[PDB]
Design a protein around this nucleic acid. Sequence first.
RNA 1: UUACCAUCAACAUGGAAACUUGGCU
RNA 2: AGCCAAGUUUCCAUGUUGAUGGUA
Length: 377
Amino acid sequence: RLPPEKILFKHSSIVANMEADWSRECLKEHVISAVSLLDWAVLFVRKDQGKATDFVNMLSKVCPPIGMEVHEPKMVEVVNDRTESYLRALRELIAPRLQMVVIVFPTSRDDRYSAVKKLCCIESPIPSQVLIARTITQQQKLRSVAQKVALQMNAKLGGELWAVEIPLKSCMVVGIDVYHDKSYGNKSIAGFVASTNPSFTRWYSRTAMQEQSQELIHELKLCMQAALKKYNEMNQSLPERIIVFRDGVGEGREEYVSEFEVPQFNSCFSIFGENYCPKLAVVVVQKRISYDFYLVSQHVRQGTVSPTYYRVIYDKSGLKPDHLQRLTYKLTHMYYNWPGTIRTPAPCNYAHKLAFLVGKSLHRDPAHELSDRLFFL
RNA sequence: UUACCAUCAACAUGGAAACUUGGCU
RNA sequence: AGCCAAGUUUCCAUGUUGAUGGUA
């Protein structure tokens, strides 16, 4: 087997799991850093009434093993239970006076998901927690669901649960992703994520709405310049190397990417002065079946695995190939929805989920202040 | 919408040939 | 005939709504 991904937490060190998702371990160990939950609220409907209160003391129980002294939340109950009820609940009784909110709803579809993601992530910056009352409605199963949910508020508030040791200090990782949706006139949204520390705990996310691909190059140069100045303000240094990912676009536009974006990725990024040429690397990432590499990272319990194809389309880093393969094993960072790892590296699904919320129906842009934390999860 | 999903049923795009009306030209 | 359409018929992969089992 390849060398694993050792994970470190506050006064603890945990090896990779036998099932390769370190689930049970993070169910019974600490956190690197966790924003304290002091003033927060849950809102419920009486159909889940007892399963409301059996939830909230749950949030006072599982977390001291995870190392997070969570306090009692605030009761909210309001009658109406539609998408417009979600809208008035998320545009009026929602403010930065609260930390972040927990919502239980009986059952719902993707449209109210778009409603909560639109009204939690655009105007008033507060990435609240939405959890349905269908998966917790049975006893002796709320254990793992509530523990994952507890991890999700402790991640999506500015806190940072896990990290991977990085030999490539003073170097960041950038994920750029494109959503392939033609329902809303083929808007073709783009999601950008950039890390703001060599430990990769903090990041920086952005998304703008545009159809065409001519001013797209200039605007993502401006966005990456914002990313580099943010990285310089957090880090007070300069990243020599830069790694840029893909999502799963096939060979129908790989030549188009290599002829258009790759020479433009070296075009006018030397604005910082003189002779500071940054080493760059762009890799194409495929799932279904500078060097190509297949990765086994996710362990499957049902069905056959899908090993992940990597095609480095551009490289100036000079990174060592053994360091490259160990990094590519570790390149599935974070992913605070799913503890452990997946097939594909982290910023691919990260900006893919970002593209999912903005390109479902969100014909707007997320806030700039919602970049340091990981709001979109 | 706790995430990850394994499969199925249906649907838009992308085609591949057959066939009908055919127009052509 | 060839091409051009109006197309349909099935397959036909990608994306994509539901559901069957689930790992917790």
